[PDB]
Ligand binder design. Sequence first.
Ligand SMILES: [Mg+2]
Ligand SMILES: [Mg+2]
Ligand SMILES: [Mg+2]
Ligand SMILES: [Mg+2]
Ligand SMILES: [Mg+2]
Ligand SMILES: [Mg+2]
Ligand SMILES: [Mg+2]
Ligand SMILES: [Mg+2]
Ligand SMILES: [Mg+2]
Ligand SMILES: [Mg+2]
Ligand SMILES: [Mg+2]
Ligand SMILES: [Mg+2]
Ligand SMILES: [Mg+2]
Ligand SMILES: [Mg+2]
Ligand SMILES: [Mg+2]
Ligand SMILES: [Mg+2]
Ligand SMILES: [Mg+2]
Ligand SMILES: [Mg+2]
Ligand SMILES: [Mg+2]
Ligand SMILES: [Mg+2]
Ligand SMILES: [Mg+2]
Ligand SMILES: [Mg+2]
Ligand SMILES: [Mg+2]
Ligand SMILES: [Mg+2]
Lengths: 125, 225, 187, 128, 53, 147
Amino acid sequence: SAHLQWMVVRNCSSFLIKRNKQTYSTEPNNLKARNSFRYNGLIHRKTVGVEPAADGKGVVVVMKRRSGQRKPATSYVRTTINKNARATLSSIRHMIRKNKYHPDLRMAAIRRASAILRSQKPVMV
Amino acid sequence: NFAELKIKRLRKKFAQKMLRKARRKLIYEKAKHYHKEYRQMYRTEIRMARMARKAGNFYVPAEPKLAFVIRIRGINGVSPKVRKVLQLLRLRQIFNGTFVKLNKASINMLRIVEPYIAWGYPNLKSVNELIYKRGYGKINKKRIALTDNALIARSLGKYGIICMEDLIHEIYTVGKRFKEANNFLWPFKLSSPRGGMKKKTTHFVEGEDAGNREDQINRLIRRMN
Amino acid sequence: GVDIRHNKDRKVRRKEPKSQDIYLRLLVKLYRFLARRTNSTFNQVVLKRLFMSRTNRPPLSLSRMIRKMKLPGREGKTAVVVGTITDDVRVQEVPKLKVCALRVSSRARSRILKAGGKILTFDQLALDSPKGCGTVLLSGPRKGREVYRHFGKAPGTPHSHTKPYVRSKGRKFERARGRRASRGYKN
Amino acid sequence: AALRPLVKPKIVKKRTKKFIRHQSDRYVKIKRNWRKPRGIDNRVRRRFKGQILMPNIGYGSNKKTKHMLPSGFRKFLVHNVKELEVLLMCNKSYCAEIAHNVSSKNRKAIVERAAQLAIRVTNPNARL
Amino acid sequence: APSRNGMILKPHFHKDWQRRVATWFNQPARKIRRRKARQARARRIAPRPASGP
Amino acid sequence: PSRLRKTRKLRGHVSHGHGRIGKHRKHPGGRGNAGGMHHHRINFDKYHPGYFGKVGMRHYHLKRNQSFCPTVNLDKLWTLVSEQTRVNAAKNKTGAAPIIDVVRSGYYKVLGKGKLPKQPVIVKAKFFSRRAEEKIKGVGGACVLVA
RNA sequence: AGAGGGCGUGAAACCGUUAAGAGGUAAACGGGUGGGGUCCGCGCAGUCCGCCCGGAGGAUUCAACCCGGCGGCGGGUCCGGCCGUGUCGGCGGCCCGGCGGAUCUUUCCCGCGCGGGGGACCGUCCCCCGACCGGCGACCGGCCGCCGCCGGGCGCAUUUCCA
RNA sequence: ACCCACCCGACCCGUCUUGAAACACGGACCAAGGAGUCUAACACGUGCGCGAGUCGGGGGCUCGCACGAAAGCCGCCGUGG
RNA sequence: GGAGCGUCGGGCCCAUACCCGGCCGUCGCCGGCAGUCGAGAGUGGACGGGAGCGGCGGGGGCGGCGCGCGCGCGCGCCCGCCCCCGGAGCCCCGCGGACGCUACGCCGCGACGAGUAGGAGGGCCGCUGCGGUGAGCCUUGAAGCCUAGGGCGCGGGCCCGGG
Ligand SMILES: [Mg+2]
Ligand SMILES: [Mg+2]
Ligand SMILES: [Mg+2]
Ligand SMILES: [Mg+2]
Ligand SMILES: [Mg+2]
Ligand SMILES: [Mg+2]
Ligand SMILES: [Mg+2]
Ligand SMILES: [Mg+2]
Ligand SMILES: [Mg+2]
Ligand SMILES: [Mg+2]
Ligand SMILES: [Mg+2]
Ligand SMILES: [Mg+2]
Ligand SMILES: [Mg+2]
Ligand SMILES: [Mg+2]
Ligand SMILES: [Mg+2]
Ligand SMILES: [Mg+2]
Ligand SMILES: [Mg+2]
Ligand SMILES: [Mg+2]
Ligand SMILES: [Mg+2]
Ligand SMILES: [Mg+2]
Ligand SMILES: [Mg+2]
Ligand SMILES: [Mg+2]
Ligand SMILES: [Mg+2]
Ligand SMILES: [Mg+2]
């Protein structure tokens, strides 16, 4: 299920990273990058991921589909939000709120989305 | 449904508030009665002494049922029997104090551990400082400070002692709950006596500080508390 | 300086199972939560016996399970064993059972499912009765191991019935001086 | 301006000197790395007055300020650009540390990517 | 010196056994050699049974 | 794993866990089982009784082929035969009474430990116990010898 | 050759020179400081900003709301079908299924009382529709509620960016 | 963190010992090597699989061996412990 | 005319000893957290009838089994509503429920902390080689070495800056 493969993955995963007292996890769809049971997108039935766009403008949001397990090609769906950033935070908030789609990732996905928003601008003079 | 649950919640909050005010009034009136009993006792002892002196008589006062014992010598170089009696009287450090009721067994234990303790018969204000300033109780085997009457009311609610005033009244006027009150009280970690000790090693009769301070224990309690 | 004898300040009981098996650790997590939430002592005893070792949870036999469950009063009752259920081939008839265990052997499982009983696991037992109602908690023979035949009072000593550590029993390896009244002394 | 941490506590340290090994002043083969004295008659072992002190557990720093830099961050050793997105949600409390074996060609890419992601690097001006 | 309740053991290691240790690392190659000799014998006697009489 | 052995935790310790006053010398009390009657006598008395002395006769050319007599109890008797044989029992209006060949199963003597279920049998064995024969004739079976 | 024919890198013990400090209780060390140096981090003020709100400067578009399409979540009388388990029905596959048996039959066959293949029996694994309990995260096609994305109508008290 | 100055403390480490700074022993200094290992028999505790059974030793069948002298299997699945 | 001797009175000095406070570690808590109102703890609510400012007519006991921050509150008009939190808006939300959850984790109290010979546990201390793993590092400079630089860890040691 989920706790079983968490008990497997929690110490011998390829994305696990020790080295100087913090244990992170570097897989895709792991926002906040923690090696925790809340923040792991590979295991759970419902998965929210926040990534920057490939073109450089906008934020892609990855939603796990639930329509098929054992099928990683159709397991996720990607959408692209490139708007005036208040509608971006509100749209991702409505995605995780109104769809009842695992609300523990909600505010943390808002954090990662708006940090990517501050990333995709000229930073210095 | 929801308005009914709202009115039920307000009823429960009002019930808790009214019961808390009733217990508060109980504590106030029992403290007033304890004040009246203390004034009664301090009056009637002087009354007995005056009516004994009016004729050709003498009022021998009662041996007081309560003593306060302080271990004044440390743990290094201690006899096995004396160490056993000190750990039965809960005196494991230097400068610990306990309230001990008096009978033949207690007097014989204190007289066989005389050279390591200073014990005397304390006073009401001495009990007041030792319980208010040094109020530490044993709740779930933990040395918890007595910052509320609810702690004593939860621990000794089945013994009739539900407040600081009930505990002080039991300890001072020793009754049938002195064992439970003394087991509730952690042994008092008192500080070093301000002003210096006279002499630790010899007895109070020969100029030392060990032994029986049966009236002079109160000055040492004021110095150590 | 305070005079605490620090020899027994650390209680040497089990806090977690020493094994690294993940199904047992998930059962441990579930009964941890049931122990520190439910007011029943059944979940605490189940958690404490999931903590123990393999030589400390003994295998429970099927005929002793039939014996202890045909006691009066325990009709409609389930038998919760925190070890293994082993089959006895020397019992003939077996009634309907409701057995909860970590592991049941194949012959005992076939015998119970042929008699018409039910074999639950511990997660199914927690879904059925979370407080442990309708349960009888059993355990196998603790002193039944051969290792306890060598323990206790020493051999070569009167009124002692301890099996000595002999590499091969026979006529001339023991039963001589120390066991014969003719050869010096016996005990 | 620089990159400020989330909270700036007053880092208190119970001892800031090094626990040197006994007779390392006298001998060159005796290094400064601590070895506990285990002799039957050793001044340092049985703790006489006015000597070197042994490292006990009592010198332990506070858990809120353990492994903390004087700036207010905690180090994280970073080799490549892909390891910079690890500290993307930790930039207010953790800082990147570029390794020694990283070349100067991609070190500039790591520094500019951390500047885009608003992550403090404790050594940006090293190679150039 | 035996102590505190063990077996009264008699190990047979009082000779020069380390000169006469017979290590068995040959034996999978020996199984291969026996297999090759058995297949060569079976190819030698071509209509005859491979086990023998 | 020498990583987990005790010699790693004893680096820095002088006597290596073997004592400062009495050092780990080579053989302090002799080699092997030395000193039977002397200086290990208390050990050889309170932990190995009967270790010294002769008892019993000597059988020079002994072999286990003559004394091989494997024993089976009556409590495990229907285990040697398949389960449908006792399914097809107490039926057919006959008193079917199946035959349990014990030598075919691999035992010679049938002992009398345990409870036997009420079903007639023909136990063919080389040797019998008297208590086993009493239990079989009390159930209603028959003990048949075989060589 | 800062790799020069015992020459890849070239540590420590030891020696020479330069710079700095010091020097009559042998030198050296621990705790607490002070002073002088070599470097590091600022700084021609570093007051660092992250949100929300008010005001005077600007501005491209769109959100509010509808239309069309796509994708996703949740679900009802369980809407219709597959799928799926627990029981019941046809004992129906049992010969249009193999295996195993220390249950019978040599009413049979073959190779000569035996072995194999048949015949019943038992146990183990399957076919068709219908009902109930959990429709069970093992899947769809319609229906409803909601969310997100794309293209238009949305001309400016709304909307968002620089100071 | 480099050096110097002051106040207080401060005898040279390891070992034999009841007791070492010892007028007890080893010891100029530095670099490298350097001392509880391996097999068998046991005993106890622990981890795992199966369970009145368990184990395949040895051998045989599959691949010509890169990985391999690995792995898989056995009317030998029990001759035997 | 003690800085000597004997009996003494005030004040004063400090040990790692005692008291209070800060931090670290160990042990104990039937410890708390997979998500709720609840602090001497001694309930909630459908459902049928009468209907009510009435309510259970119990110890100068000095109190918990009970009363005046409501129980018929308010609105429309004597009768009815007495409603849902996609939101009563609250020190508690029985409607889903972390920022706090590597549950081998996090958090809250209480006590304790000497040590040879010895025993046990944890090492994200260190060396070498192997099976996986890092879309790992590297002639735009690996290992090694030096360092009067920045540091971290109680410590074993480790990460950078320069040559
Ligand atoms: Mg003393
Ligand atoms: Mg100790
Ligand atoms: Mg102990
Ligand atoms: Mg000594
Ligand atoms: Mg052959
Ligand atoms: Mg030691
Ligand atoms: Mg030695
Ligand atoms: Mg040892
Ligand atoms: Mg010895
Ligand atoms: Mg060169
Ligand atoms: Mg070379
Ligand atoms: Mg070269
Ligand atoms: Mg050279
Ligand atoms: Mg000697
Ligand atoms: Mg000694
Ligand atoms: Mg001597
Ligand atoms: Mg010495
Ligand atoms: Mg001398
Ligand atoms: Mg000598
Ligand atoms: Mg010499
Ligand atoms: Mg070396
Ligand atoms: Mg032993
Ligand atoms: Mg074992
Ligand atoms: Mg044998």
